[PDB]
């Protein structure tokens, strides 16, 4: 229930077993990844990328559905975007050790199953509209991102920094040019992300 | 909350960083493993084994606390006993693919972190006293055990079969000589388990 295996169960079963030449790519994420597919479906169709994002989910939920929504899809590569809802405390108090640990566990599971990994930055957010009591999201996001990047460097995992071209000001907000609500990217925001992730995927394969 | 990181958080933090010569061993399980430490504390003390069992937990909860209660303890080896509460439906409907997948994910995480793994049989149970509506626990336990054993054979992981010397009759019950409630082993039951697991641990190290 909690992991929401039901969301992609029918679609996973409907997916044919892949061949190595089709270079299957799976995107693991929350609303930023589920919304990516909804907003620019042609980016995923054109490039042969599979979206496995679920709105509101944390890295805890990602870890539990990781074997079903990634490993069992036999992809050549997985993109992992995780942490936004963890900092927003969607499933409990925020603990960087646990959230980072879940990202490292997913990276380790994918590599154990001979799947290439691309780690990514949690997008900047000055605050979360669904939980405005959290006042230190920029500090938490910045600390989690440096930990993800250091772990990626230590394990020769490509790290895609969506955060660096998307952040603005002292409050470390998501650039208003790329968002309307300060968390979710608009089409213009997704265009920045697309250029970076397409390039990193193509370099790895 | 759900994974119950709080149960062993203080004890994990209190554990000194190990040296390779101390051959740290961690036992991952449910009430059968938590009760093992309570009943025969000297077996764990004498052999330098660390118990990380939590009563009532399923493989879903094990997977979420696996990095904190196993990986971060830097053990030379982990023993995994998982499935009893999954068949008892303690956290949801029973799904062998998901439960087996969680055991395989834990085995893969441990091997990714250079930790040896010992996989084990779910103990026989004719029924669960806390959920007697489940009438097909013997079929489910037998199927999950053969899947665990086949996966262990395919990956050269030692498999410890507690089930085979402990099972009796057509209803595949836990031998009354080793239990009072039909699920939890008595001291005599634990003695069978101790001889098997001590031997397998010593052979692997």
CSV table of C-alpha atoms in Angstrom, one decimal:
chain,number,residue,atom,x,y,z
A,1,UNK,CA,0.0,0.0,0.0
A,2,UNK,CA,2.5,2.6,1.3
A,3,UNK,CA,5.1,2.0,-1.6
A,4,UNK,CA,2.2,2.2,-4.1
A,5,UNK,CA,3.2,-0.9,-6.2
A,6,UNK,CA,-0.4,-0.6,-7.7
A,7,UNK,CA,0.4,2.6,-9.6
A,8,UNK,CA,2.7,0.9,-12.2
A,9,UNK,CA,1.8,-2.8,-11.7
A,10,UNK,CA,-0.3,-3.1,-14.9
A,11,UNK,CA,2.1,-1.0,-17.1
A,12,UNK,CA,5.2,-3.0,-15.8
A,13,UNK,CA,3.5,-6.3,-16.7
A,14,UNK,CA,2.5,-4.9,-20.1
A,15,UNK,CA,6.2,-4.0,-20.8
A,16,UNK,CA,7.9,-6.5,-23.1
A,17,UNK,CA,11.3,-8.0,-21.9
A,18,UNK,CA,14.0,-5.6,-23.3
A,19,UNK,CA,17.0,-6.3,-25.6
A,20,UNK,CA,20.4,-4.6,-24.7
A,21,UNK,CA,20.3,-2.6,-28.0
A,22,UNK,CA,17.1,-0.8,-27.0
A,23,UNK,CA,19.1,0.8,-24.1
A,24,UNK,CA,16.0,0.9,-21.7
A,25,UNK,CA,16.1,4.0,-19.4
A,26,UNK,CA,13.9,4.3,-16.3
A,27,UNK,CA,13.3,7.6,-14.4
A,28,UNK,CA,12.7,7.1,-10.7
A,29,UNK,CA,11.2,10.1,-8.9
A,30,UNK,CA,8.3,11.9,-7.3
A,31,UNK,CA,5.9,14.6,-8.8
A,32,UNK,CA,8.8,16.3,-10.5
A,33,UNK,CA,9.4,13.1,-12.6
A,34,UNK,CA,5.6,12.1,-12.8
A,35,UNK,CA,4.8,15.7,-14.0
A,36,UNK,CA,7.8,15.6,-16.4
A,37,UNK,CA,6.0,12.8,-18.4
A,38,UNK,CA,2.6,14.6,-18.2
A,39,UNK,CA,4.0,18.0,-19.4
A,40,UNK,CA,6.5,16.8,-22.1
A,41,UNK,CA,5.3,13.3,-23.1
A,42,UNK,CA,7.2,13.6,-26.4
A,43,UNK,CA,10.6,14.0,-24.6
A,44,UNK,CA,10.1,10.5,-23.1
A,45,UNK,CA,8.6,8.9,-26.3
A,46,UNK,CA,11.3,10.3,-28.6
A,47,UNK,CA,14.2,9.2,-26.4
A,48,UNK,CA,12.8,5.8,-25.4
A,49,UNK,CA,12.7,6.8,-21.6
A,50,UNK,CA,10.3,5.2,-19.1
A,51,UNK,CA,8.8,7.4,-16.4
A,52,UNK,CA,8.2,5.8,-13.0
A,53,UNK,CA,7.5,8.9,-10.9
A,54,UNK,CA,4.8,9.1,-8.2
A,55,UNK,CA,3.6,12.4,-6.9
A,56,UNK,CA,4.3,13.0,-3.1
A,57,UNK,CA,6.6,10.0,-2.6
A,58,UNK,CA,9.8,10.0,-0.5
A,59,UNK,CA,13.0,8.0,-0.9
A,60,UNK,CA,11.6,5.5,1.6
A,61,UNK,CA,8.7,4.6,-0.7
A,62,UNK,CA,11.1,4.7,-3.7
A,63,UNK,CA,13.4,2.1,-2.0
A,64,UNK,CA,10.4,-0.3,-1.4
A,65,UNK,CA,9.1,-0.2,-5.0
A,66,UNK,CA,12.7,-0.1,-6.5
A,67,UNK,CA,12.9,-3.8,-7.5
A,68,UNK,CA,9.4,-3.7,-9.0
A,69,UNK,CA,9.6,-0.4,-10.8
A,70,UNK,CA,13.3,-0.5,-11.9
A,71,UNK,CA,15.2,-3.8,-11.3
A,72,UNK,CA,12.5,-6.1,-12.8
A,73,UNK,CA,12.2,-3.8,-15.9
A,74,UNK,CA,15.8,-4.9,-16.8
A,75,UNK,CA,16.9,-1.3,-17.8
A,76,UNK,CA,20.3,-0.4,-19.1
A,77,UNK,CA,20.2,2.7,-16.9
A,78,UNK,CA,18.2,4.4,-14.2
A,79,UNK,CA,17.9,8.1,-13.4
A,80,UNK,CA,17.2,8.8,-9.7
A,81,UNK,CA,15.7,12.0,-8.4
A,82,UNK,CA,14.8,11.7,-4.7
A,83,UNK,CA,14.6,13.9,-1.6
A,84,UNK,CA,12.1,16.8,-2.2
A,85,UNK,CA,9.3,15.0,-0.3
A,86,UNK,CA,11.7,13.8,2.3
A,87,UNK,CA,12.7,17.4,3.2
A,88,UNK,CA,8.9,18.2,3.0
A,89,UNK,CA,8.5,15.4,5.7
A,90,UNK,CA,5.7,13.7,3.7
A,91,UNK,CA,6.3,10.3,5.5
A,92,UNK,CA,8.0,11.4,8.8
A,93,UNK,CA,10.6,13.7,10.4
A,94,UNK,CA,13.5,14.5,8.2
A,95,UNK,CA,16.7,12.6,8.7
A,96,UNK,CA,19.5,13.2,6.1
A,97,UNK,CA,21.3,9.9,7.0
A,98,UNK,CA,18.1,7.9,6.3
A,99,UNK,CA,17.1,9.8,3.1
A,100,UNK,CA,20.7,9.8,1.7
A,101,UNK,CA,21.0,6.1,2.8
A,102,UNK,CA,17.9,5.2,0.7
A,103,UNK,CA,19.4,6.9,-2.4
A,104,UNK,CA,22.7,5.0,-1.9
A,105,UNK,CA,20.8,1.7,-1.3
A,106,UNK,CA,18.9,2.3,-4.6
A,107,UNK,CA,22.2,3.1,-6.5
A,108,UNK,CA,23.8,-0.1,-5.0
A,109,UNK,CA,20.8,-2.3,-5.9
A,110,UNK,CA,20.9,-1.0,-9.5
A,111,UNK,CA,24.7,-1.6,-9.8
A,112,UNK,CA,24.3,-5.1,-8.2
A,113,UNK,CA,21.8,-5.9,-11.1
A,114,UNK,CA,24.2,-4.5,-13.8
A,115,UNK,CA,22.1,-1.3,-14.3
A,116,UNK,CA,24.0,2.0,-14.8
A,117,UNK,CA,23.0,4.8,-12.5
A,118,UNK,CA,22.7,8.6,-12.9
A,119,UNK,CA,22.3,10.4,-9.5
A,120,UNK,CA,20.7,13.9,-9.6
A,121,UNK,CA,20.3,17.0,-7.5
A,122,UNK,CA,17.1,17.6,-5.5
A,123,UNK,CA,15.7,20.8,-7.1
A,124,UNK,CA,15.9,24.1,-5.2
A,125,UNK,CA,12.8,25.0,-3.1
A,126,UNK,CA,12.5,28.0,-0.8
A,127,UNK,CA,9.4,26.4,0.9
A,128,UNK,CA,6.8,23.7,0.2
A,129,UNK,CA,3.3,25.0,-0.4
A,130,UNK,CA,1.7,21.9,1.3
A,131,UNK,CA,3.8,22.3,4.5
A,132,UNK,CA,4.9,26.0,4.9
A,133,UNK,CA,5.9,25.3,8.6
A,134,UNK,CA,9.3,23.9,7.3
A,135,UNK,CA,11.5,27.0,7.2
A,136,UNK,CA,15.0,25.5,6.5
A,137,UNK,CA,14.3,23.5,3.2
A,138,UNK,CA,17.2,25.4,1.4
A,139,UNK,CA,19.9,24.3,4.0
A,140,UNK,CA,18.6,20.7,4.1
A,141,UNK,CA,18.4,20.5,0.2
A,142,UNK,CA,21.9,22.0,-0.1
A,143,UNK,CA,23.4,19.5,2.5
A,144,UNK,CA,21.6,16.5,0.9
A,145,UNK,CA,22.8,17.5,-2.6
A,146,UNK,CA,26.5,17.8,-1.6
A,147,UNK,CA,26.3,14.3,0.1
A,148,UNK,CA,24.7,12.8,-3.1
A,149,UNK,CA,27.4,14.4,-5.3
A,150,UNK,CA,30.3,13.3,-3.0
A,151,UNK,CA,28.9,9.7,-3.0
A,152,UNK,CA,28.6,9.9,-6.8
A,153,UNK,CA,32.2,11.1,-7.1
A,154,UNK,CA,33.4,8.3,-4.8
A,155,UNK,CA,31.7,5.6,-6.8
A,156,UNK,CA,32.3,7.0,-10.4
A,157,UNK,CA,28.5,7.6,-10.8
A,158,UNK,CA,27.5,10.5,-13.1
A,159,UNK,CA,25.9,13.3,-11.1
A,160,UNK,CA,23.4,15.6,-12.9
A,161,UNK,CA,23.2,19.0,-11.2
A,162,UNK,CA,19.7,20.4,-12.0
A,163,UNK,CA,20.0,22.7,-9.0
A,164,UNK,CA,23.0,24.8,-10.0
A,165,UNK,CA,21.4,26.5,-13.2
A,166,UNK,CA,17.9,26.5,-11.5
A,167,UNK,CA,18.7,28.2,-8.2
A,168,UNK,CA,18.3,32.0,-7.5
A,169,UNK,CA,18.9,34.5,-4.6
A,170,UNK,CA,19.9,34.3,-0.9
A,171,UNK,CA,16.7,32.2,-0.1
A,172,UNK,CA,18.0,29.6,-2.7
A,173,UNK,CA,14.6,29.5,-4.5
A,174,UNK,CA,13.7,27.7,-7.7
A,175,UNK,CA,14.1,30.4,-10.4
A,176,UNK,CA,10.7,32.0,-11.1
A,177,UNK,CA,11.6,31.7,-14.8
A,178,UNK,CA,11.3,27.9,-14.4
A,179,UNK,CA,8.3,27.6,-11.9
A,180,UNK,CA,4.9,29.0,-10.9
A,181,UNK,CA,4.6,27.4,-7.4
A,182,UNK,CA,8.3,27.4,-6.4
A,183,UNK,CA,8.7,23.5,-6.3
A,184,UNK,CA,7.3,22.1,-9.6
A,185,UNK,CA,9.0,23.1,-12.9
A,186,UNK,CA,7.0,24.6,-15.8
A,187,UNK,CA,7.7,23.6,-19.5
A,188,UNK,CA,10.6,26.1,-19.5
A,189,UNK,CA,12.0,24.6,-16.3
A,190,UNK,CA,11.7,21.1,-17.8
A,191,UNK,CA,13.6,22.2,-21.0
A,192,UNK,CA,16.7,23.0,-18.8
A,193,UNK,CA,16.5,19.6,-17.1
A,194,UNK,CA,15.9,17.8,-20.5
A,195,UNK,CA,19.2,19.2,-22.1
A,196,UNK,CA,21.2,18.0,-19.0
A,197,UNK,CA,19.7,14.5,-18.5
A,198,UNK,CA,19.6,13.7,-22.3
A,199,UNK,CA,23.3,14.5,-22.6
A,200,UNK,CA,24.3,12.5,-19.5
A,201,UNK,CA,22.2,9.5,-20.6
A,202,UNK,CA,23.8,9.6,-24.2
A,203,UNK,CA,27.3,9.9,-22.7
A,204,UNK,CA,26.8,6.8,-20.4
A,205,UNK,CA,25.3,4.7,-23.3
B,1,UNK,CA,8.2,5.0,12.1
B,2,UNK,CA,7.0,2.0,10.1
B,3,UNK,CA,10.6,0.5,9.7
B,4,UNK,CA,11.2,1.1,13.5
B,5,UNK,CA,14.7,2.6,13.2
B,6,UNK,CA,14.2,3.7,16.9
B,7,UNK,CA,14.4,0.2,18.2
B,8,UNK,CA,18.2,-0.2,17.6
B,9,UNK,CA,19.3,3.5,17.0
B,10,UNK,CA,20.9,4.0,20.5
B,11,UNK,CA,22.6,0.5,20.4
B,12,UNK,CA,23.9,1.0,16.8
B,13,UNK,CA,25.4,4.4,17.8
B,14,UNK,CA,26.9,2.8,20.9
B,15,UNK,CA,28.6,0.0,18.8
B,16,UNK,CA,32.3,0.7,18.2
B,17,UNK,CA,33.6,0.6,14.5
B,18,UNK,CA,34.7,-3.0,13.9
B,19,UNK,CA,38.0,-4.5,12.8
B,20,UNK,CA,38.1,-7.3,10.1
B,21,UNK,CA,39.5,-9.8,12.7
B,22,UNK,CA,36.5,-9.5,15.0
B,23,UNK,CA,34.3,-11.0,12.1
B,24,UNK,CA,31.2,-9.0,13.1
B,25,UNK,CA,28.0,-11.1,12.4
B,26,UNK,CA,24.5,-9.5,12.3
B,27,UNK,CA,21.2,-11.4,12.5
B,28,UNK,CA,18.3,-9.8,10.6
B,29,UNK,CA,14.9,-11.1,11.5
B,30,UNK,CA,11.6,-10.8,13.2
B,31,UNK,CA,10.3,-12.3,16.6
B,32,UNK,CA,12.1,-15.6,15.8
B,33,UNK,CA,15.4,-13.7,15.8
B,34,UNK,CA,14.5,-11.1,18.6
B,35,UNK,CA,13.3,-14.1,20.8
B,36,UNK,CA,16.5,-16.0,20.0
B,37,UNK,CA,18.6,-13.3,21.8
B,38,UNK,CA,16.1,-13.1,24.7
B,39,UNK,CA,16.0,-16.9,25.2
B,40,UNK,CA,19.7,-17.8,24.7
B,41,UNK,CA,21.6,-14.6,25.2
B,42,UNK,CA,24.8,-16.6,25.8
B,43,UNK,CA,24.7,-18.1,22.3
B,44,UNK,CA,25.1,-14.5,20.9
B,45,UNK,CA,27.6,-13.3,23.5
B,46,UNK,CA,29.9,-16.4,23.2
B,47,UNK,CA,30.0,-16.4,19.4
B,48,UNK,CA,30.2,-12.5,19.0
B,49,UNK,CA,26.8,-12.3,17.1
B,50,UNK,CA,24.6,-9.2,17.0
B,51,UNK,CA,20.9,-9.6,17.1
B,52,UNK,CA,18.8,-7.1,15.1
B,53,UNK,CA,15.4,-8.9,15.2
B,54,UNK,CA,12.1,-7.0,15.7
B,55,UNK,CA,8.9,-8.9,16.7
B,56,UNK,CA,6.1,-8.7,14.1
B,57,UNK,CA,8.2,-7.2,11.3
B,58,UNK,CA,7.9,-8.2,7.6
B,59,UNK,CA,10.6,-8.2,4.9
B,60,UNK,CA,9.3,-4.7,3.7
B,61,UNK,CA,10.2,-3.2,7.1
B,62,UNK,CA,13.6,-5.2,7.1
B,63,UNK,CA,14.5,-3.7,3.7
B,64,UNK,CA,13.8,-0.1,4.9
B,65,UNK,CA,16.0,-0.5,8.1
B,66,UNK,CA,18.6,-2.7,6.3
B,67,UNK,CA,21.2,0.1,5.8
B,68,UNK,CA,20.9,1.3,9.4
B,69,UNK,CA,20.7,-2.1,11.2
B,70,UNK,CA,23.2,-4.0,9.0
B,71,UNK,CA,25.2,-2.1,6.3
B,72,UNK,CA,26.2,0.8,8.7
B,73,UNK,CA,27.3,-1.8,11.4
B,74,UNK,CA,30.1,-2.8,8.8
B,75,UNK,CA,29.6,-6.6,9.5
B,76,UNK,CA,31.7,-9.3,7.9
B,77,UNK,CA,28.5,-11.3,7.5
B,78,UNK,CA,24.7,-11.0,7.8
B,79,UNK,CA,22.2,-13.8,8.5
B,80,UNK,CA,18.7,-13.1,7.0
B,81,UNK,CA,15.5,-14.8,8.3
B,82,UNK,CA,12.5,-13.1,6.7
B,83,UNK,CA,9.0,-14.1,5.6
B,84,UNK,CA,7.0,-15.4,8.6
B,85,UNK,CA,5.1,-12.1,9.1
B,86,UNK,CA,4.8,-11.5,5.4
B,87,UNK,CA,2.8,-14.8,5.0
B,88,UNK,CA,0.9,-13.7,8.2
B,89,UNK,CA,0.0,-10.5,6.3
B,90,UNK,CA,1.2,-8.2,9.1
B,91,UNK,CA,1.7,-5.2,6.7
B,92,UNK,CA,-0.6,-6.1,3.8
B,93,UNK,CA,-1.8,-8.9,1.4
B,94,UNK,CA,0.7,-11.6,0.8
B,95,UNK,CA,2.7,-11.3,-2.5
B,96,UNK,CA,5.5,-13.9,-2.9
B,97,UNK,CA,7.2,-11.8,-5.7
B,98,UNK,CA,7.4,-8.7,-3.4
B,99,UNK,CA,8.5,-10.7,-0.2
B,100,UNK,CA,11.1,-12.7,-2.1
B,101,UNK,CA,12.2,-9.5,-3.9
B,102,UNK,CA,12.8,-7.8,-0.6
B,103,UNK,CA,15.0,-10.8,0.6
B,104,UNK,CA,17.0,-10.7,-2.8
B,105,UNK,CA,17.3,-6.8,-2.5
B,106,UNK,CA,18.7,-7.2,1.1
B,107,UNK,CA,21.2,-10.0,-0.1
B,108,UNK,CA,22.3,-7.7,-3.1
B,109,UNK,CA,22.8,-4.6,-0.8
B,110,UNK,CA,24.9,-6.7,1.6
B,111,UNK,CA,27.1,-8.1,-1.3
B,112,UNK,CA,27.4,-4.5,-2.8
B,113,UNK,CA,28.8,-3.4,0.6
B,114,UNK,CA,31.3,-6.5,0.7
B,115,UNK,CA,29.2,-8.2,3.4
B,116,UNK,CA,28.8,-12.1,3.2
B,117,UNK,CA,25.3,-13.3,3.3
B,118,UNK,CA,23.6,-16.4,4.7
B,119,UNK,CA,20.0,-16.9,3.5
B,120,UNK,CA,17.7,-19.0,5.7
B,121,UNK,CA,14.4,-20.9,5.5
B,122,UNK,CA,11.2,-19.4,6.9
B,123,UNK,CA,10.3,-21.8,9.8
B,124,UNK,CA,7.3,-24.1,9.3
B,125,UNK,CA,4.0,-22.8,10.7
B,126,UNK,CA,0.6,-24.7,10.3
B,127,UNK,CA,-1.2,-21.4,11.2
B,128,UNK,CA,-0.5,-18.0,12.9
B,129,UNK,CA,-2.2,-17.6,16.3
B,130,UNK,CA,-2.7,-13.8,15.8
B,131,UNK,CA,-4.4,-14.3,12.3
B,132,UNK,CA,-6.0,-17.8,12.1
B,133,UNK,CA,-8.1,-16.8,9.0
B,134,UNK,CA,-4.9,-17.6,6.9
B,135,UNK,CA,-5.4,-21.3,6.0
B,136,UNK,CA,-2.6,-21.8,3.4
B,137,UNK,CA,0.5,-20.7,5.3
B,138,UNK,CA,2.2,-24.2,4.7
B,139,UNK,CA,1.9,-23.9,0.9
B,140,UNK,CA,3.1,-20.2,0.9
B,141,UNK,CA,6.0,-20.9,3.3
B,142,UNK,CA,7.1,-24.0,1.2
B,143,UNK,CA,7.0,-22.0,-2.1
B,144,UNK,CA,8.8,-19.0,-0.7
B,145,UNK,CA,11.5,-21.3,0.8
B,146,UNK,CA,12.2,-23.1,-2.5
B,147,UNK,CA,12.5,-19.6,-4.2
B,148,UNK,CA,15.0,-18.4,-1.6
B,149,UNK,CA,17.0,-21.6,-1.9
B,150,UNK,CA,17.1,-21.5,-5.8
B,151,UNK,CA,18.2,-17.8,-5.6
B,152,UNK,CA,20.9,-18.8,-3.0
B,153,UNK,CA,22.1,-21.7,-5.3
B,154,UNK,CA,22.2,-19.3,-8.4
B,155,UNK,CA,24.3,-16.7,-6.5
B,156,UNK,CA,26.6,-19.1,-4.5
B,157,UNK,CA,25.0,-17.8,-1.2
B,158,UNK,CA,25.0,-20.4,1.6
B,159,UNK,CA,21.4,-21.5,2.5
B,160,UNK,CA,20.6,-22.7,6.0
B,161,UNK,CA,17.5,-25.0,6.0
B,162,UNK,CA,16.0,-24.6,9.5
B,163,UNK,CA,12.7,-25.9,8.1
B,164,UNK,CA,13.7,-29.4,7.0
B,165,UNK,CA,14.6,-30.8,10.5
B,166,UNK,CA,11.9,-28.8,12.2
B,167,UNK,CA,8.8,-29.7,10.0
B,168,UNK,CA,6.3,-32.5,10.8
B,169,UNK,CA,3.2,-34.2,9.4
B,170,UNK,CA,0.9,-33.5,6.4
B,171,UNK,CA,-0.1,-30.0,7.7
B,172,UNK,CA,3.7,-29.1,7.7
B,173,UNK,CA,3.6,-27.9,11.3
B,174,UNK,CA,6.6,-26.7,13.4
B,175,UNK,CA,7.5,-29.9,15.4
B,176,UNK,CA,5.7,-29.8,18.8
B,177,UNK,CA,9.1,-30.9,20.3
B,178,UNK,CA,10.5,-27.4,19.3
B,179,UNK,CA,7.5,-25.1,20.0
B,180,UNK,CA,4.6,-24.4,22.3
B,181,UNK,CA,2.5,-22.0,20.1
B,182,UNK,CA,3.4,-23.5,16.6
B,183,UNK,CA,5.3,-20.5,15.4
B,184,UNK,CA,7.9,-19.5,18.0
B,185,UNK,CA,10.7,-22.0,18.9
B,186,UNK,CA,11.3,-23.0,22.5
B,187,UNK,CA,14.9,-23.4,23.9
B,188,UNK,CA,15.0,-27.0,22.4
B,189,UNK,CA,13.9,-25.5,19.0
B,190,UNK,CA,16.6,-22.8,19.2
B,191,UNK,CA,19.3,-25.5,20.0
B,192,UNK,CA,18.5,-27.2,16.5
B,193,UNK,CA,18.9,-23.7,14.8
B,194,UNK,CA,22.1,-22.8,16.8
B,195,UNK,CA,24.0,-25.9,15.6
B,196,UNK,CA,23.1,-25.2,11.9
B,197,UNK,CA,23.7,-21.4,11.9
B,198,UNK,CA,27.0,-21.6,14.0
B,199,UNK,CA,28.4,-24.2,11.6
B,200,UNK,CA,27.4,-22.2,8.4
B,201,UNK,CA,28.9,-18.9,9.9
B,202,UNK,CA,32.2,-20.7,10.9
B,203,UNK,CA,32.4,-22.3,7.4
B,204,UNK,CA,31.9,-18.9,5.6
B,205,UNK,CA,34.6,-17.1,7.9
